[PDB]
Amino acid sequence: GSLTEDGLSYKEKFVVRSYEVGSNKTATVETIANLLQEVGCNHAQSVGFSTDGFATTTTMRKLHLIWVTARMHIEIYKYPAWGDVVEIETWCQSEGRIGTRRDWILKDSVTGEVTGRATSKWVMMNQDTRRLQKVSDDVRDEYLVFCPQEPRLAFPEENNRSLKKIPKLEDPAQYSMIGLKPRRADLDMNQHVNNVTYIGWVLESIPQEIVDTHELQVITLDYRRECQQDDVVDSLTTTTSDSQFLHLLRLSGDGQEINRGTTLWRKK
Amino acid sequence: GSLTEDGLSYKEKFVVRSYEVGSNKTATVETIANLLQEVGCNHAQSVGFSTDGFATTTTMRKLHLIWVTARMHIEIYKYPAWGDVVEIETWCQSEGRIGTRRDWILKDSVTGEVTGRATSKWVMMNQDTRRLQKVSDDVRDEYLVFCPQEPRLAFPEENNRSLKKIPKLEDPAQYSMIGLKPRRADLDMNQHVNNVTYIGWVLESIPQEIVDTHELQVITLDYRRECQQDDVVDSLTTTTSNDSQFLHLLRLSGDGQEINRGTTLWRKK
Ligand SMILES: CCc1nnc(NC(=O)[C@H]2CCCO2)s1
Numbered sequence: 183g184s185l186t187e188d189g190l191s192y193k194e195k196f197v198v199r200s201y202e203v204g205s206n207k208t209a210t211v212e213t214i215a216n217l218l219q220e221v222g223c224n225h226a227q228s229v230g231f232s233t234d235g236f237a238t239t240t241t242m243r244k245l246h247l248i249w250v251t252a253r254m255h256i257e258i259y260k261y262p263a264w265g266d267v268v269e270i271e272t273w274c275q276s277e278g279r280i281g282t283r284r285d286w287i288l289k290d291s292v293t294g295e296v297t298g299r300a301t302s303k304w305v306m307m308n309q310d311t312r313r314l315q316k317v318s319d320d321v322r323d324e325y326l327v328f329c330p331q332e333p334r335l336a337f338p339e340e341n342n343r344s345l346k347k348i349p350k351l352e353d354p355a356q357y358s359m360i361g362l363k364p365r366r367a368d369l370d371m372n373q374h375v376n377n378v379t380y381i382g383w384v385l386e387s388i389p390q391e392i393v394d395t396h397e398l399q400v401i402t403l404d405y406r407r408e409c410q411q412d413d414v415v416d417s418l419t420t421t422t423s424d425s426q427f428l429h430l431l432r433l434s435g436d437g438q439e440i441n442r443g444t445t446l447w448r449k450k
Numbered sequence: 451g452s453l454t455e456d457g458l459s460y461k462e463k464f465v466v467r468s469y470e471v472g473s474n475k476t477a478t479v480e481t482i483a484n485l486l487q488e489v490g491c492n493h494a495q496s497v498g499f500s501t502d503g504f505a506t507t508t509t510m511r512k513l514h515l516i517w518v519t520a521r522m523h524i525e526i527y528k529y530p531a532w533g534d535v536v537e538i539e540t541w542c543q544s545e546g547r548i549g550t551r552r553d554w555i556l557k558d559s560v561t562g563e564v565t566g567r568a569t570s571k572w573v574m575m576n577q578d579t580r581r582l583q584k585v586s587d588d589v590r591d592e593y594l595v596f597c598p599q600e601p602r603l604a605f606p607e608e609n610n611r612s613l614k615k616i617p618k619l620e621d622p623a624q625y626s627m628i629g630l631k632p633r634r635a636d637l638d639m640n641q642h643v644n645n646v647t648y649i650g651w652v653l654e655s656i657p658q659e660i661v662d663t664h665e666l667q668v669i670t671l672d673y674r675r676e677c678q679q680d681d682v683v684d685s686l687t688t689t690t691s692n693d694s695q696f697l698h699l700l701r702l703s704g705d706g707q708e709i710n711r712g713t714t715l716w717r718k719k
């Protein structure tokens with residue numbers, strides 16, 4: 183993998199591994215989300231960022247500032263099969279004072295066809311107090327030299343699926359998965375729970391019958407609070423409709439919300 | 451990756467991914483175990499076996515027979531870091547009428563140094579009734595043409611760590627992790643729980659303080675029963691011992707039915 187000719191985006195190819203496929207003989211949504219995170223880290227390293235979960239840059243590290251995700255939106259049209267080669271292109275962009283946006287384009291390396299696309303919103307915050315102090319003009323200069331100056335959006339459509347307000351799930355939930363805990367495989371270098379784990383936990387409340395008759399097409403997820411290593415999560419789901427669902431992840435005890443989102447599934 | 455010049459073993463290189471590393475800034479033991487399974491699958495495809503995790507041959511598929519693991523033994527001397535290139539060499543061998551043995555050698559592609567090695571015992575079994583059976587002549591001749599004829603062992607030593615009898619953990623356990631469940635990421639094409647998941651569940655009862663002051667050197671695990679998709683596991687551990695050793699036990703919560711038992715040896719950083 184490497185930065186493109188203009189240095190304003192990053193490309194990388196991946197072969198789909200045998201342990202990365204699920205009950206469809208094709209890659210799982212956690213494999214796809216993991217591959218997005220991998221190409222995002224390699225892009226951050228190729229431009230001088232911190233390589234950890236946050237692409238910190240200088241003066242941000244001086245002020246104990248980190249980039250945290252607020253929203254993840256993934257759309258998949260064709261899940262790659264075992265042995266397939268998938269090319270992913272990622273790029274960074276400034277969203278004024280609110281934060282950053284990271285986009286991805288998934289392609290089949292054989293047919294050159296777009297088989298998926300993703301978008302994410304990142305907010306700036308203090309690593310210790312966790313307060314979203316997204317105020318810094320000189321910090322914006324250190325990352326802008328790596329972003330395309332003209333807008334380049336994976337989902338360009340005016341007021342699309344990635345910019346929709348997600349409501350809160352009313353109790354009782356139609357489907358649920360209680361007692362979900364992270365394991366050592368789900369933790370990073372600083373022992374924080376991987377962003378891809380939350381996606382997998384959201385889908386643990388989808389019934390097996392839906393997974394056996396449908397394929398996941400769209401997933402919009404909002405990150406409200408981070409799940410600690412010793413925390414326990416409850417996954418909630420209700421059919422809002424193709425099939426559509428409303429999701430909610432909360433701490434098993436107090437019922438403190440960590441995530442909320444929507445999923446759209448298609449018949450096979 | 452490809453079969454070697456003689457066609458009796460398989461080699462493959464892997465770059466360590468960012469999501470594959472843990473608290474040590476190096477690959478997790480589940481990443482290592484996953485890479486062994488990946489090169490094992492590619493070796494099985496390159497010689498004509500099934501790629502569903504059972505390495506099934508023509509006659510085996512006709513009689514509803516599959517290959518299932520009975521023991522896993524992994525030894526790691528240096529965990530690869532993010533961005534490192536690790537070369538793994540795997541090969542199969544017949545163990546008479548008991549079953550098969552699959553071995554691995556892990557090397558750093560830069561220094562050519564051996565940074566790990568693994569061994570596994572595989573028994574033949576009816577896919578449906580789960581009854582183990584002795585390897586017949588028709589089946590044996592179909593897989594022997596892919597195994598080296600002279601013995602090639604990753605752990606050659608006379609009475610090594612990979613052929614030791616593992617005892618059963620007496621209650622109460624010193625450490626424990628209750629309510630472990632598999633997720634959709636842990637299931638294969640036929641919805642069976644991945645063999646690497648059991649290794650991760652065994653290590654969930656090791657205290658965080660041991661993980662923060664030591665690195666896992668050896669792991670011997672025995673597979674007694676398979677955990678179903680809707681099953682829940684209890685992980686048990688007791689210190690048996692610079693180095694630290696433990697005894698492990700995985701069992702179902704609703705009955706205490708054993709699925710795994712093993713030993714782990716850790717060394718100071
Ligand atoms: C879908 C899950 C994720 N996708 N991407 C992730 N992370 C990243 O791309 C890197 C670059 C920004 C800092 O972290 S998490």
Ligand SMILES: CCc1nnc(NC(=O)[C@H]2CCCO2)s1
Pocket residue numbers: 483484486487488489490491494503504505517522552645646
């Ligand atoms: C450590 C976990 C595993 N290591 N290896 C595994 N599987 C394999 O190598 C292949 C060989 C044919 C059967 O499956 S499971």
